[PDB]
A and B are shown apart, each in its own frame.
With several copies, the nearest count.
Chain A
Amino acid sequence: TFAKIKFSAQIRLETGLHIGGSDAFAAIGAINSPVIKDPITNLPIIPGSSLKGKMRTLLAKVYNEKVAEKPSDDSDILSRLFGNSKDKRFKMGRLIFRDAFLSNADELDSLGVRSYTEVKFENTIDRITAEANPRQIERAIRNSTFDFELIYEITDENENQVEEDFKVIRDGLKLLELDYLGGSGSRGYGKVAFENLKATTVFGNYDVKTLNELLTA
């Protein structure tokens, strides 16, 4: 058979994140570590590439028996969810990480927000000669929230591995909450919560009753 089921979630930032960004034509005084933004609404983005990238390497401390040293040395539970290139069966693997977009921009006008990002001064202090080294790095503001879709393929090759993979998906989402998703991270800048963990089938026929009881539990 064939089915595709869709993990929805709502990413709430805490001490909001800095997924580092684009522009070289910036300024002499203004934001010099820009954040990645939508080119059309200029709202901050969590790209799905960084979500998948943190999620692999946080799941790979846990799900690799032998140490990685490369992707395509992951342990056939991460090769099937994130793809290898060098397994014949695990190349397109089973998970699509869409880019998260800023959802509550109207809620963050009822709170007194001038702009949906903030600029934060950060200052390398030298420990001899005490000279300072300032910088203005941008980050999305704290109570920003994001739509989060993550699509999963269930073919016949997902014979009985759907539940075993959803353990890994809800293990990786709770493991990103213990870590930081891009940016400085050791200096704040990271802490992400996932609310409303909800899986629905978008194609095919599959039961999402028993799926939403290792998500919300």
Chain B
Amino acid sequence: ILTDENYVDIAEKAILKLERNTRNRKNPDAFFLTTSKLRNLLSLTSTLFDESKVKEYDALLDRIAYLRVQFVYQAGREIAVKDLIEKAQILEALKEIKDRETLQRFCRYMEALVAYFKFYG
């Protein structure tokens, strides 16, 4: 669960609790996660935030049901995302939606992840 009063701090604590380069100490503390792959994660939600604004949840429930699968498939390919869908409770908090204002809050959580990822790195 992520609520409207905690999700940004959850997102900061998830981006910090995330692995880094142990070796290659020339410019250290660089993540084993790249900006392109995390923007690939946010691309899945950017075309649902607009329709969370526009139209009803009973046409977006199908697209959230496939959003679970999109996060599963991105978790399976690279191990960098695989240790981000667990740190950030993404698959846990994706089952927690059930309306519009939690879909919007989840998309804002993804943006908070991207924001703290740009801010650290």
* Interface, chain A (partner B; CB < 8 A): 23-25, 27-31, 42, 115, 117, 119, 136
Contacts and interface: CB of A to CB of B under 8 A. Distances in A.
Given A27-B111, A28-B115, A115 B51 contact: yes
Contacts of B40: 24
26 contacts: A23-B47, A24-B43, A24-B46, A25-B47, A25-B66, A27-B46, A27-B111, A28-B42, A28-B69, A28-B73, A28-B114, A28-B115, A29-B42, A29-B46, A29-B111, A29-B114, A30-B46, A30-B47, A31-B50, A42-B53, A42-B55, A115-B50, A115-B51, A115-B55, A117-B54, A119-B47
A29 B43 contact: yes
Contacts of B114: 28-29
A40 to B, nearest CB: 12
Contacts, number: 43
Interface in B32-89: 39-40, 42-47, 49-51, 53-55, 63, 66, 69, 73
Interface residues of B, number: 22
A200 B6 CA distance: 59
A177 B53 CA distance: 32
Q: Is the interface of B mostly helix, strand, loop or mixed?
A: helix
Given A24-B44, A115-B55, A30 B49 contact: yes
**Complex A-B, nearest 6 residue pairs according to Cβ-Cβ distance, in ascending order:** A29-B46, A24-B43, A30-B46, A28-B111, A29-B42, A24-B44
Contacts of A23: 47
Contacts of B49: 27, 30
Contacts of B54: 42, 115, 117
A140 to B, nearest CB: 13
B121 to A, nearest CB: 15
A119 B43 CA distance: 13
Contact of B47 (A24, A28, A117): A24
A212 B53 CA distance: 42
Contacts of A30: 46-47, 49-50
Most buried by A among B40, B63, B111: B111
A182 B69 CA distance: 31
Contacts of A31: 50
Nearest to A42: B54
Nearest to B47: A24
